[PDB]
Design a protein around this ligand. Structure first.
Ligand code: FES
Lengths: 64, 144, 53, 66, 230, 62, 229, 149, 40, 51, 146, 89, 62, 336, 72, 248
């Protein structure tokens, strides 16, 4: 795991350095988005696992 | 106190009061409704203090005698309790604040003549007078 | 200004009303001349009161 | 009742389409919309606003027998 | 496994929040019971480092940050970088990555655009040995290596600034535009003015080094005066 | 002093600036005390002076 | 005189009973400052390091307002045309960061560029677009739904319906970030316990009568805003 | 269902247990227990007070402190003397309510409305044709409040 | 408006980098800034 | 389900959640209100059923 | 507008509509309004006195300000935005709608032959230097003085 | 249902007409519900809008008992019938 | 209509999908098909989403 | 339970109309629709309460185990017919349906026309079969015929595509409701088939109208013409929809029309011929002339803002609708 | 509503039931007159308090009709 | 009165016992909550007062300043005269050079006074007004000078007395501003000779700014007790009737 932004790219052309930085930034943004989505899905899974049984019990008792 | 009450259904205080299970249940229901409404009113009062102590005292006094109407056994006692309730309603209406704190700065050297409170008082008083006269005439005719 | 409500303090004086309000001629006349009445000046308000009467 | 064959200037005060408050724009096909013809708009919003002028005039309007 | 770990982390965060809320409420109630006024102190709730849930900022200890600076969300700062007084780094939307030994002027606001087209990232990428003037406004930009930005310079979203570039104060790098290397840009509408010179580049590098040294001296002064954390 | 726990001093305390106006009044002392007795005597004297006939018709009749 | 360690900067500051009013779901950054009679709408997001001085005159901020960072807003007390010299903002105004506002009117659906200056008497109508790093000449009316730029600003081109819709959507984008930032802070501030007891805190120099407490009846009020003072 | 022993410190609990939710009985219905004195005077009712009434008064006084505190929590901008006087008046009202409850319990015991250590010679035989609560109360705390289910 | 992620990661977008070239020299004193992204 | 106590506890939890949500304040605030409201609602429901 | 590229912004003073109004203190006050704004809106912005404005402009959908007035419009909701226009201004305004006349007729205070609803009045370029008077409108309910 | 059980066709028709008129009157107010933007009708306490949590809870309970309370009508009906049973007894 | 090309098949279509104006935001261009019924953001299976740079910085500062 | 479930759908429809419709005039339209639906619900509730009070039981078998008097049966039938016709809709209680289809959102109108009318018809059929009536169905038959005639005759004057589709749907609903007027006779199968065909055709027409309003940003024919020249697939779909709406022999509309017309001619031949003459020609000619004028032409207007072709989702939806309409005729005859 | 209306209902049902043969005509006439006179007034309110009062009046009239039915 | 005695005893016991025990329990629970939520959270910190930052030998002399903002940053060698005002969010870094602020000198909000050179004296004359959100770089501004909001004073600018730099204008490097001259625009050019009415308006604005600074300093220098008292007064005014206001 190497941060290309935190790397010595002074040995290449500015355009190539910018392209490499852009690639590294794209990889890091993809990783951040994936981690954020993994955490966000938990915001649904935990509430789904929590209140489903109580809601079913309450609705059943109210109906039958 | 009503929850622990027990006894036999009969007339009380020279047949001027009716103590029946239905009357007790009606009194209990009225008291429960009044208590819920009072809790709501207190919660609203904690938000903004737009009401004075006099309005609360009038409400408490009205609530003190409101449940007694269900125990009436004769039209004379009913008329007296209804007149008392009407007087309490008029007193509560008189307890309404006439002025309120507003950001209306343009009206500082001009007079705004609002006749809402006076109209309410006049209408309530005249209707109460007419209704009391009718109820008294009805009672007098029924007794004969 | 402290204790003056929406009324603020200017440079050459202090206002008698809210910001961007209407300066009443009667209020200014009362404030300037405390009790001086050089004449019963016939203003629009006075004429309106006379017409109402 | 019939349309006037004579040429008329573009409508100035005619019922026009109004969007509901906080209406999310329908940006289908790139949200490329142009200004509508005033006459077309007036004709579109004509029937929904048309009403009789006199009471009972609904009977003799058009063809009485029909 | 990852979903279960994320759920466990969220549950731990929720339990900690509940415990902290219960403790604070109990403390306030006790202060009320004991007739104390310490619980209602009008102390400011501002924090110079804001961890946005999972977005925990990360910066090496070599960096210098004024207490008034506001770094919020996912930020990744290099070593020995200096952050100006009151400068804002908003990492709530996307990551904000900065290289080592870079100087950012006071009241410099760096943030990210909500979204953009493909080929232009929404993350603010800054290189090393760069200098940013006070009042700078960076949005969703990619600036490379030792760039010079004047006072009150605004780089819009999609900007790509090449290494060895100079922008005079009160300039604006347009949205989605490329700043050529070894050239000076002028005007709010950024127009190329002249190629950067060796003397100017050396002076800019020396100024960046001096800014880093000044930041180190300020951090040393703040540590003694108890005005610096840790 | 200050029982500093982590970052929060567990002994931090601010004395309230709001208290009763008659907090230290003699009448505020426990009923039956000498100061309370003197204050009650003064209050009863004031009440009898302001409403003499009322006090007589209330207490004496009672 | 000015010697202290813990800063006393309070974001909400009244001046002679000119208390600011805050709506619902609002996100006021703790680094920002709001002094004077400022009435903010529901769900407005004020960024950090921004100053709103409602001293010279009142300021009305709309509901879907998004104020950028380093933005300085102040009134003038009087305008050349004699019209109301107070800052008024429409329902949804997205003001760029590091902006300057001097008793100017902004209608609803307004987009203000970063580092832009709106002086006295200026009035940007509905749908207006002002580019970054621009200066509006004092006492000028920006055409409604117009994209203008310059120093002084010049009418560039009319904005499209798609552009207006995109701007309106961009206004709605900050709601989630503001909600997250609000959820970041706790309902009860934790700075009070972090200090050490003082002599005045232990020994009050003067006593005051007990009245309606500043937090009297606060038990029944929901703590919607964690940053409540 | 058993009843708390009469003339004890917990005789007021018998007023919290009823056979049916009927507020009053019929004009011709026999009381659950023998009647001591239907023609009861105020002096007789006062003489009828006992440890049950004393315990009811004590319970009212004890519970009156929390109610008085709750009432006082709603007072603002009032002097300490005024707050103390109001709290004392509220506590006195609570004690008066407790005394009234004790007097009512004594009157019921003298009339046989509640348990007073007396049992009729021949029990009234009632067949519970509609019994939808026997099982419900038989597996909860609801039985302790229902006299004879 | 659209709020999805354009820069997908499930695959690589096939792009032609020779269609458009960004100007990098000889810009006029009033010339406009070249486009940073020119991939088609 | 079948237990009036369980139904009341579920009703109290749901009421607390709904009150917190309608207040626009974030959830997990005043956690002491959760078990207290649950117990109160369970008691109220059991008493209502018995009555 | 038809503004071209590079043109400077127009001063709002050139678009200032002047309304000379007789306020209840019998005071001649000059208000400035912008084109397209309601008379009630202009009065509220200028903090004019004498207008109770109980309905605050009435309904917000299919309002009387729309041109032409829709047949399903509900008209005014109060009787507080009463303004007496000058003879030229009232003549240019025209005849009040059916709902406008029905609402103006049921007013506690006496009305004039040139009385129109401020919330139903729209700013037109013809209304420059317009003369209006604002007799004290009535107060209706207990919350009107709040 | 009670009127039909009592065989009152004229009363049923009059009640239906009155209910229709009331529905129209009550729904007429729903037309004025729409607003161009979010309004501000909440009182402000400590410089910010104050929302009563207790009032919110009471309103939530009422809305719950109104939206889905139709299923629980059996217990209330039984209680009312029991109350009315001793009215003539 | 002759110059129209929505999918960029007959003519090259830039990844930016627009040339940003010198005074207008670089907001995303409106797609021809505005179907909002798009599934969740799908990352490739077994994707490393851990904060590599942040972990390196944590190791450095520790 | 049936009545309670039938009454619950009004609240979701009102909520959708009040919060999802884009038109500003849709507020009064939603109010009118709610009012008409509540009037129909009140009539149905009065009838149901009368039925329940007459026989204190909740089973159709128990209802069959009881006989209602002449006046009771007449009143019950009249009230059920009135409620179901207000919910059908029927003339002259079709103003609510017209305004709704004019102003409601495309998805809601597709669901409102497709489902609610069918639910009301199903409820009316279920209640009618469970109650034996000795009265003459002449009133209901004449009401249905007059409503069909009125709906078909107004087609030539409808320039709004949504309005024309609404008029056609009203005519189809009246025709369908005409079928079940013969009591528990062998007329239910034709009514069910016609209801299914009308649902499919109305769904197709509403989808086409929605696609046009998304593409051309309009619903009137005066501003949009020459669709096929710029939208070939849309024009072909419109032509196919017109062919299907013509009751072509291969479609289930042909079989349902054959059954219904056979029953009518068995009862009233001249009335059946008149009904066939009006709807199949006059209303059909009006719908086609309104649809054809927009189908063809040359859309010279708005060159720089011309719309694009239909998306693959809409194409698949249209293909599915056509497949349902066609293959639905191949179902087993055990139920038909 | 809770005291006065219920008391009037009980007076017409439980107290003066022996005279219900006479109260029926008066109650029916009053209900018809109210239904005929209040419908026109119920569509011209322009105050929230007036609307609440009109709702209360409509509910009272409906309850009066219900009590008239109950007395049968 | 046994009731009053019991009330006093209960209040004493409740306060003197529960306050300590409940306060300690709450503190422990808060510590546990702050520990559990780590590291995906943040806690309140003691914000340093950046208004008196002294670097090595440079210590600010701002005691004579009439208005010093609570949130302003004053670091290094900056000496201000009497009546000086520094508004909120301003940043005066004297590390990069000595600063000489004159009497009645107003520096508005969010103004960055930073010297371009590492050692240069930035000298502002008496009664000099600076606009908000400005950027000054080591300049010599004479007395009665006016600088608008969002202005950019470059390194070499030398402003004469009573010179006006309009808001939004950016003076170029090495510019000499003439007296009674007003300049505007991003490239600052001498726009016009200041009329007496304009000068009077500018002076009135400066005086109003001084008065507002004095009022704010009267407000900004409140203690915790004063702030609590002001909040309680606002709350009481929210519930004080017109009779209460008349009595006051
Ligand atoms: S706002 Fe009511 S009359 Fe115009």
């Amino acid at each position: 795991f190497e941060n290309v932004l935190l790397s010595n790219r002074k040995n290449l052309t500015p355009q190539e350095s910018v392209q490499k930085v852009i690639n590294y930034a794209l990889l890091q943004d993809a990783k951040q988005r994936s981690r954020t989505l993994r955490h966000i899905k938990a915001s649904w899974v935990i509430p789904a696992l929590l209140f489903t049984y109580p809601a079913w019990y309450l609705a059943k008792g109210a109906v039958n | 106190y009503l929850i622990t009450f027990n006894g036999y259904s009969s007339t009380f205080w020279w047949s001027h009061f009716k103590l029946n299970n239905y009357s007790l249940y009606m009194y209990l229901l009225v008291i429960i409704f009044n208590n819920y409404f009072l809790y709501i009113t207190e919660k609203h009062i904690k938000i903004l203090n737009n009401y004075s102590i006099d309005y609360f005292f009038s409400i408490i006094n009205i609530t003190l005698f409101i449940p007694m109407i269900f125990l009436s056994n004769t039209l004379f006692t009913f008329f007296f309790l209804i007149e008392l309730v009407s007087c309490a309603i008029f007193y509560k209406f008189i307890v309404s604040k006439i002025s309120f704190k507003n950001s209306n700065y343009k009206d500082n050297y001009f007079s705004i003549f609002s006749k809402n409170y006076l109209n309410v008082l006049f209408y309530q008083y005249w209707s109460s007078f007419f209704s009391s006269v009718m109820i008294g005439f009805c009672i007098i005719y029924l007794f004969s | 200004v402290k204790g003056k409500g929406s009324i603020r303090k200017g440079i050459h004086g202090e206002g008698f009303g809210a910001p961007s309000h209407a300066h009443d001629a009667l209020i200014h006349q009362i404030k300037q001349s405390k009790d001086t009445m050089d004449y019963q000046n016939i203003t629009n308000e006075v004429a309106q009161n006379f017409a109402n009467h | 009742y019939m349309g006037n064959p004579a040429v008329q200037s573009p409508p100035k005060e005619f019922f026009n389409y109004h969007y509901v408050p906080d209406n999310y724009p329908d940006a289908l096909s790139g949200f490329r919309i142009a200004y509508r013809d005033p006459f077309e708009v007036q004709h579109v919003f004509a029937y929904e606003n048309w009403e009789y002028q006199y009471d009972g005039q609904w009977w003799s309007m058009g063809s009485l027998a029909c | 496994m990852k979903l279960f770990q994320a759920m466990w982390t969220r549950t731990i965060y929720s339990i900690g929040r509940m415990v902290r809320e219960t403790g604070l409420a109990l403390d306030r109630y006790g202060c009320k019971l004991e007739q104390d006024i310490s619980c209602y102190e009008p102390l400011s709730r501002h924090r110079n480092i804001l961890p946005i849930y999972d977005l925990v900022p990360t910066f090496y200890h070599s960096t210098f940050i004024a207490p008034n600076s506001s770094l919020i969300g996912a930020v990744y700062l290099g070593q020995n970088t200096v952050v100006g007084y009151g400068s804002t780094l908003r990492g709530d939307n996307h990551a904000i990555r900065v290289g080592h030994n870079t100087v950012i002027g006071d009241k410099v606001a760096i943030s990210n655009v909500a979204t953009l087209a493909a080929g232009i990232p929404v993350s603010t990428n800054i290189g090393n040995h760069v200098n940013i003037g006070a009042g700078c406004v960076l949005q969703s930009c990619v600036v490379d290596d030792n760039v010079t930005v004047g006072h009150n310079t605004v780089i819009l979203e999609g900007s790509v600034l090449e290494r060895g570039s100079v922008i005079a104060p009160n300039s604006l790098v347009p949205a989605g535009r490329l700043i050529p290397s070894g050239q000076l840009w002028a005007g709010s509408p950024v127009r190329y003015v002249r190629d950067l010179k060796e003397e100017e580049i050396k002076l800019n590098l020396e100024q960046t080094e001096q800014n880093l040294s000044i930041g180190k001296t300020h951090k040393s002064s703040l540590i003694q005066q108890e005005a610096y954390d840790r | 002093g200050d029982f500093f726990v982590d970052k929060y001093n567990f002994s931090r305390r601010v004395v309230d600036h709001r208290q009763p106006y008659d907090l230290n009044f003699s009448i505020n002392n426990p009923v039956g005390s000498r100061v309370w007795f003197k204050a009650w005597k003064q209050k009863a004297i004031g009440n009898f002076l302001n409403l003499v006939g009322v006090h007589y018709a209330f207490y004496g009749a009672g | 005189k000015y010697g202290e360690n813990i800063s006393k900067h309070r974001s909400l500051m009244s001046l002679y009973d000119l208390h600011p009013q805050i709506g619902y779901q609002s996100y006021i950054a703790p680094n920002s400052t709001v002094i004077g009679e400022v009435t903010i709408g529901n769900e407005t997001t004020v960024w950090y390091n921004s100053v709103i001085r409602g001293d010279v005159n009142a300021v009305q901020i709309g509901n879907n307002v998004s104020i950028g960072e380093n933005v300085v807003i102040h009134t003038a007390g009087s305008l050349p045309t004699g019209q109301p010299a107070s800052v008024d903002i429409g329902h949804y105004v997205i003001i760029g960061s590091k902006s300057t506002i001097y008793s100017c009117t902004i209608q609803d659906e307004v987009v203000i560029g970063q580092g832009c200056v709106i002086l006295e008497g200026a009035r940007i109508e509905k749908g207006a677009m002002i580019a970054a790093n621009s200066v509006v000449p004092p006492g000028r009316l920006i055409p409604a739904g117009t994209l203008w730029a310059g120093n002084p600003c010049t009418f560039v081109r009319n904005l499209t319906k798609s552009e207006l819709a995109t701007n309106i959507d961009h206004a709605k984008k900050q709601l989630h970030l503001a909600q997250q930032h609000r959820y970041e802070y706790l309902p009860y501030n934790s700075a009070y316990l972090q200090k050490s007891n003082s002599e005045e805190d232990l020994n009050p120099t003067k006593y005051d009568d007990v009245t309606i407490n500043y937090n009297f009846g606060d038990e029944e009020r929901a703590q919607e805003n964690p940053l409540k003072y | 269902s058993q009843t708390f022993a009469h003339d004890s410190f917990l005789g007021g609990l018998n007023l919290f247990k009823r056979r049916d939710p009927r507020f009053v009985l019929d004009q011709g219905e026999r009381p659950p227990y023998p009647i001591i004195n239907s023609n009861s005077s105020f002096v007789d009712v006062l003489s009828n007070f006992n440890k049950a009434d004393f315990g009811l008064v004590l319970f009212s006084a004890a519970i009156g402190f929390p109610l008085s505190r709750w009432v006082l929590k709603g007072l603002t901008f009032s002097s300490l003397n005024y707050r103390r006087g109001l709290f004392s008046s509220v506590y006195g009202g609570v004690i008066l309510w407790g005394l009234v409850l004790g007097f009512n319990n004594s009157y019921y015991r003298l009339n046989g409305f509640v348990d007073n250590g007396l049992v009729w010679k021949r029990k009234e035989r009632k067949l519970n044709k509609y019994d939808f609560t026997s099982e419900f109360e038989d597996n909860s705390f609801f039985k302790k409040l229902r006299i004879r289910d | 408006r659209q709020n999805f992620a354009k820069n997908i990661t499930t695959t690589d977008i096939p792009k032609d980098s020779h269609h458009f070239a960004a100007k990098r020299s000889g810009f006029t004193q009033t010339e406009q800034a070249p486009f940073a992204y020119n991939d088609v | 389900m079948s237990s009036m106590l369980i139904w009341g506890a579920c009703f109290g939890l749901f009421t607390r959640a709904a009150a917190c949500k309608a207040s626009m304040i974030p959830l997990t605030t005043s956690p002491w209100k959760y078990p207290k409201y649950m117990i109160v609602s369970a008691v109220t429901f059991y008493y209502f059923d018995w009555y | 507008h038809h503004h071209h590229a590079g043109d400077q912004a127009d001063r709002v003073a050139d678009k200032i509509i002047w309304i000379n109004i007789q306020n209840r203190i019998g005071q001649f006050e000059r208000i400035s309004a912008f084109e397209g704004e309601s008379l009630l809106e202009a009065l509220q912005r200028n903090k004019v006195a004498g207008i109770v404005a109980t309905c605050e402009g009435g309904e917000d959908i299919n309002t009387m300000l729309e041109k032409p007035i829709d047949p399903v419009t509900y008209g005014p909701f109060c009787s507080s935005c009463q303004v007496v226009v000058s003879n030229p201004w009232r003549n240019k305004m025209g005849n009040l709608h059916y709902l406008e006349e029905r609402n103006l007729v049921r007013s506690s205070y006496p009305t004039t032959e040139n009385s129109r609803l401020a919330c139903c009045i729209l700013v037109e370029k013809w209304m420059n230097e317009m003369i209006i008077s604002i007799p004290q409108n009535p107060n209706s309910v207990y919350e009107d003085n709040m | 249902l009670y009127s039909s059980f009592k065989s009152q066709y004229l009363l049923i028709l009059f009640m239906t007409i009155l209910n229709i008129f009331g529905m129209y009157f009550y729904i007429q107010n729903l037309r004025f519900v729409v607003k161009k933007n979010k309004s501000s009708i909440l009182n402000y306490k400590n410089y910010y809008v104050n929302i009563n949590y207790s009032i919110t809870l009471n309103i939530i309970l009422l809305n719950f008992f109104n939206f889905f309370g139709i299923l629980f009508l059996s217990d209330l009906i039984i209680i009312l019938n029991y109350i009315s049973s001793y009215i003539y007894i | 209509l002759l110059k129209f090309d929505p999918f960029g098949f007959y003519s090259p279509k830039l990844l930016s999908e627009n040339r940003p104006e010198e005074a207008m935001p670089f907001y995303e261009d409106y797609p021809q098909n505005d179907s909002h019924w798009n599934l969740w953001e799908q990352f490739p299976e077994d994707f490393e989403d851990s904060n590599a740079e942040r972990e390196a910085i944590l190791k450095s500062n520790k | 339970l049936f009545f309670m479930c039938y009454e619950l759908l009004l609240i979701p429809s009102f909520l959708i109309v009040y919060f999802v419709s884009p038109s500003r005039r849709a507020i009064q339209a939603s109010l009118y629709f709610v009012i008409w639906t509540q009037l129909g619900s009140l009539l149905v509730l009065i009838a149901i309460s009368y039925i329940i009070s007459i026989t204190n039981t909740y089973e159709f078998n128990d209802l069959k185990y009881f006989n209602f008097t002449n006046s009771e049966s007449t009143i019950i039938i009249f009230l059920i017919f009135l409620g179901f016709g207000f919910k059908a809709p029927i003339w002259p209680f079709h103003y609510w349906l017209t305004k709704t289809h004019v102003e409601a959102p495309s998805g809601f109108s597709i669901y409102l026309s497709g489902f609610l009318v069918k639910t009301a018809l199903y409820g009316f059929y279920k209640f009618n079969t469970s109650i034996f009536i000795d009265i003459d169905s002449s009133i209901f038959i004449a009401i249905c015929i007059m409503g069909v005639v009125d709906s078909s005759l107004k087609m030539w004057g409808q320039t709004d595509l949504k309005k024309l589709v609404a008029y056609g749907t009203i005519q189809e609903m009246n025709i369908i409701y005409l079928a079940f007027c013969w009591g528990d006779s062998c007329a239910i199968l034709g009514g069910i088939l016609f209801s299914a065909t009308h649902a499919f055709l109305s769904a197709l027409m509403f989808f086409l109208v929605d696609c046009i309003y998304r593409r051309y940003h309009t619903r009137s024919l005066v501003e949009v013409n020459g669709i096929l020249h710029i939208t070939p697939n849309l024009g072909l779909s419109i032509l196919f929809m017109l062919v299907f709406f013509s009751g072509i022999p291969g479609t289930i509309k042909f079989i349902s029309e054959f059954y219904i017309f056979s029953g009518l001619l068995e009862a009233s031949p001249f009335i059946c011929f008149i009904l066939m003459l009006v709807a199949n020609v006059l209303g059909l000619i009006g719908f086609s002339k309104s649809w054809f004028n927009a189908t063809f032409g040359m859309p010279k207007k708005n060159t720089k803002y011309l719309p694009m072709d239909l998306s693959f989702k809409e194409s698949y939806i249209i293909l599915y609708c056509f497949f349902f309409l066609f293959i639905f005729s191949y179902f087993s005859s055990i139920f038909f | 509503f809770l005291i006065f209306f219920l008391f009037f209902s009980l007076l017409f049902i439980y107290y003066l039931s022996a005279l219900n043969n006479f109260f029926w005509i008066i109650l029916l006439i009053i209900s018809i007159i109210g239904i005929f006179y209040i419908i026109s007034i119920i569509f011209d309110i322009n105050l929230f308090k007036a609307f609440l009062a009109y709702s209360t009046i409509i509910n009272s009239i409906s309850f009066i009709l219900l009590i008239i039915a109950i007395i049968f | 009165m046994l009731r009053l005695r019991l009330f006093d005893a209960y209040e004493k016991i409740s306060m003197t016992f529960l306050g300590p025990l409940y306060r300690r329990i709450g503190k422990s629970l808060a510590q546990t909550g702050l520990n559990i939520q780590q590291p995906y959270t943040s806690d309140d910190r003691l914000v340093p007062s950046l208004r008196n930052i002294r670097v090595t030998n440079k210590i600010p002399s701002i005691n004579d300043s009439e208005f010093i903002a609570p949130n302003s940053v004053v670091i290094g060698d900056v000496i201000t005269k009497e009546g000086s005002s520094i508004w909120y969010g301003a940043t005066l870094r004297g590390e990069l050079g000595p600063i000489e602020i004159g009497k009645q000198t107003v520096i508005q909000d969010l103004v960055n006074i930073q010297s371009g050179k590492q050692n240069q004296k930035t000298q502002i004359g008496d009664n000099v007004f600076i606009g908000p959100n400005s950027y000054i770089q080591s300049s010599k501004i004479n007395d009665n000078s006016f600088v608008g909001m969002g202005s950019t004073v470059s390194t070499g600018c030398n402003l004469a007395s009573n010179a006006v730099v309009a808001a939004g204008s950016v003076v170029p490097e090495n510019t000499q501003v003439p007296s009674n001259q007003i300049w505007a625009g991003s490239p600052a050019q001498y726009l016009r000779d200041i009329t007496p009415e304009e000068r009077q308006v500018l002076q009135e604005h400066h005086q109003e700014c001084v008065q507002l600074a004095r009022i704010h300093a009267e407000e900004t220098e409140k203690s915790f007790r004063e702030v609590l008292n002001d909040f309680d007064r606002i709350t009481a005014e929210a519930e004080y009737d017109h009779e209460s206001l008349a009595l006051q």
